[PDB]
Design a protein around this ligand. Structure first.
Ligand code: CL
Ligand code: CL
Ligand code: CL
Ligand code: CL
Ligand code: CL
Ligand code: CL
Ligand code: CL
Ligand code: CL
Ligand code: CL
Ligand code: CL
Ligand code: CL
Ligand code: CL
Ligand code: CL
Ligand code: CL
Ligand code: CL
Ligand code: CL
Ligand code: CL
Ligand code: CL
Ligand code: CL
Ligand code: CL
Ligand code: CL
Ligand code: CL
Ligand code: CL
Ligand code: CL
Lengths: 210, 210, 210, 210, 210, 210
């Protein structure tokens, strides 16, 4: 990643074995559960495009998703080129060439070039631009691999309300509220929840159906 | 987090894989036991709002609690806006815009903005303000998920007093003393504890009923 | 903790996930065995009162002991107030208010205040004062939870002397020597140990009864 | 590796036990799966030729592949010598001798010499040149050890399309697309995929055959 | 420990959780095998007397050995006092009082005092003096707990010579050579070893009896 | 080890618990397999003679090999003394005494003396000299403990050629090529390998016999 030292300047640091192993392990254990995306974002803190490609390419398996990810990345890279066509001309001594979409995705740009953009004044945050592309594609994978629709999350006749709400928002998070939660509750709790009236908090709702 | 380097200035550091994994693991193992809250507070030492949201969002499951947490956060964010309405106007070069509740919760503010508030002179500690909101909501979850009331913690007729006191204050901690501990003791120990008289320490009480 | 950087000034550092997990694990595995106290003292090296409270509060369970600990802490805090009554008056710019017992215990003092005392010139070591209070209370727990008295540690008729001495000083350490070790030895070894005479070292004693 | 300190100069750092163990473990667990190559590249970030040889030589077993790797390395070293024949002459005080292929492979060059090239101005990146040689040879091993050809990856009559695409691109990655993926689909899905028409994305294709 | 920073001055660092756990674990696994002593010495690199006492006191169990260790430490502390009787007098501003044996053992000296001696110019290395006392006592424990004498290490009639030599020097190391190794070899190998003649290396000896 | 800080000067650092444990573990798991030697060399990066002796002495067991190692070390130390007889005389203020073989092996030299040689200008790299002695002796152990000769590595009549080549070069590495690999192949593959002709690469050979 590009990180500030203990003297105040942004320089490059090698991606750590702990970071590499942590990303691989969470994919092995959680696949594309929704909470994997913020883990990817945190573990790729300050990452260059090279670091982002490293993390994606160390994933063995799930290659259908990884190739969907590449298609989304190329879609965003082409949009970036439509909005930022580069102007031919010699690069001045204190400057960096404008990046193309494939430069931001780390496929046609060098590490020194990525360091140059990210540490520029003002910086061109090609790592953060690329990461937003990756997260966009990762979220589309989470939705597509989401097995259950929110319409099929219904409280059992003897299921504790807390467990039902857990499943409800787990499903809703992957699918990407308060009235549907009432409608899919069981007859006994739905009766209690209507007596509460509109505008009840989740805490009030869960308290009433305990 | 925002941490001081080894040269005396507050700068941003990436949240560590050890920190990320430690928060996830303690939630997996302890759910919302009371001792999880001080662990969350220590592991989020110096955290930005972005780091706090990272930690909450890496939690998979327990989504009923996580959504109750969001409702509490929004309640505190709205109160903050009622007490700190921002004044429209251009931000001077050496300054930071006042934050709104959603800025402190990290949803409408950038990392550079959070760094700017937290490292300001004087600093606006949006991380500590947000963390207090989160801990407020986490504590309400601990109470709601507390299974046993203190009234139902009674010493068994052959239960060692030490084990009973353990259960007593474990329950009391989650529910959020000395006379109730005597009343719920078994007949043999309660007889000993009355002979001790008022003002006995816990050590004296546990010594007498051994 | 408050630690010196690599440039010679005392500044605050966040308590590490390794430190937090190490304290929790040793309590889970060893409870209140005597050797847990020096582990607590080493892992709380340079700790602020906030760090000390963090470590105690991350302990789930053993709540009878943790509440005995609080009673001891309050006893020492009240003694400190009896010996150091603070003088009302405005705090000068380069100075820190005197701390009260509850300030040293980290309950009525801020982290900035604890940093201010500990890094003062001369420093007010509120962390070391608090830690001595905690260790005082922890040692009283070790004695109370010590199951066996030294009077009941007697060498078996076929028990190797080395194993008996192990149990002897394990028990003696928790209860908080040379002649009692001889008296509780078995007839065969006690006969050998009297022939050795007075002033024998433990090494000489264990050598003679092998 | 050669890394920048926290003061801005490139100096040598010892390869870490975490790095050494991480490379050994991934080879033990994954052998020469395709995703092992980017792991090797990341864990050898900033590596000298000495560090690269260290990592290769710590691999026990797979000695057929390791010897194929040496043959590829020697092939690239001989090509380098054909393109860069060194000119005999005394090395000036502020300078470094040109490297030969075996110097870049770390067999005829010292660590101080590798440090000198890599930290030169301009730098001769003998580590990155060597690493590209190693990765070239590693990729030829991945292809040769690839067990299944892409022609034999066909969707089962009841196999979910997602699982088939996973196997398809796992195989394709090791062998080193859209129309072959359709042709090898089962009759039911292939019928759906032709109705979609040309130019369908992978996401559209996987959505249609669900 | 007392360690040099990255700016060239000796300052105090807190003993690490990794160090604390590593010492505890090796004692749990290896007790007082001979190789435990160099592990203790390495893990106590740069340790203060306080750090050395921390490591010894975190050992639970083996209390017979730990008390023998204290007796040896007191013996060396008394010898030190016999050789270095301190001269009464006021300590000048830039100076440190001479240490007594109990000061070096960390029982009557503060951490600041130990830092003062160890970082003095010239330094009084109370940590290294104490460590030599500890290692002296630890080695006497290794010998006393050594179960087998070298006289009882004899090669079996079908035991491979390599395995016999392993046991031979394992035993000899704990007891604290070439002709005894020949005499205790089996008849077949002893016959071969006499034909070799005097002055044979261990490698020659093991080669001949294979 | 002796390492450069983040300010450009060579100073001493304590050998890490991770380094100590990594060396012990690899010996426990791999004994004296050939790949253990480069692991020892990497984990002893920048090591002093004291660090090298620490690593060797923390090895429990394999004492036949460790004593063969000492004999080799003494042989190299005596050769060093034959080539570098030291000249008696007072050491000037800015200088270091010449080292003897036992000084380089860390048995008659202090750590400060080893630091002085290794950080001298020009440096006397007693650590690297000693390490070469150790590796020399370690390699002789690998050969002696190598169980199988290369002459006995022959491909089975149904053994895959890849597996046979693996065993071939595993054995050859420990014993310390292309025509012997053909001669020991099975009749079917040897027939294919002769038709290939001379000068075939290992990749071509393994491809032809698949
Ligand atoms: Cl995976
Ligand atoms: Cl790849
Ligand atoms: Cl931009
Ligand atoms: Cl509930
Ligand atoms: Cl969870
Ligand atoms: Cl999220
Ligand atoms: Cl404020
Ligand atoms: Cl009790
Ligand atoms: Cl516990
Ligand atoms: Cl708490
Ligand atoms: Cl004070
Ligand atoms: Cl004994
Ligand atoms: Cl392997
Ligand atoms: Cl090798
Ligand atoms: Cl070049
Ligand atoms: Cl799908
Ligand atoms: Cl133990
Ligand atoms: Cl103790
Ligand atoms: Cl001295
Ligand atoms: Cl042998
Ligand atoms: Cl071993
Ligand atoms: Cl030793
Ligand atoms: Cl030399
Ligand atoms: Cl093959």
């Amino acid at each position: 990643p590009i990180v500030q030292n203990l003297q105040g300047q942004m320089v490059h640091q090698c991606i750590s074995p702990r970071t590499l192993n942590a990303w691989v392990k969470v994919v092995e254990e959680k696949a594309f559960s929704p909470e994997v995306i913020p883990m990817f974002s945190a573990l790729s803190c300050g990452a260059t495009p090279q670091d982002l490609n490293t993390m994606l390419n160390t994933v063995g398996g799930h290659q259908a998703a990884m190739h969907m990810l590449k298609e989304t990345i190329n879609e965003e890279a082409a949009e970036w080129d439509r909005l930022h066509p580069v102007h031919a001309g010699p690069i001045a001594p204190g400057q960096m060439r404008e990046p193309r979409g494939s430069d931001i995705a780390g496929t046609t740009s060098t590490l020194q070039e990525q360091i140059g953009w990210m540490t520029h004044n003002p910086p061109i945050p090609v790592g953060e631009i690329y990461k937003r592309w990756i997260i966009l594609g990762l979220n589309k994978i989470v939705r597509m691999y989401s097995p259950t629709s929110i319409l099929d999350i219904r409280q059992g006749p003897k299921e504790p309300f807390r467990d039902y709400v857990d499943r409800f928002y787990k499903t809703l998070r992957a699918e990407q509220t308060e009235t549907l939660l009432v409608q899919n509750a069981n007859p006994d709790c739905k009766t209690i929840l209507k007596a509460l009236g509109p505008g009840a908090t989740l805490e009030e709702m869960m308290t009433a159906c305990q």
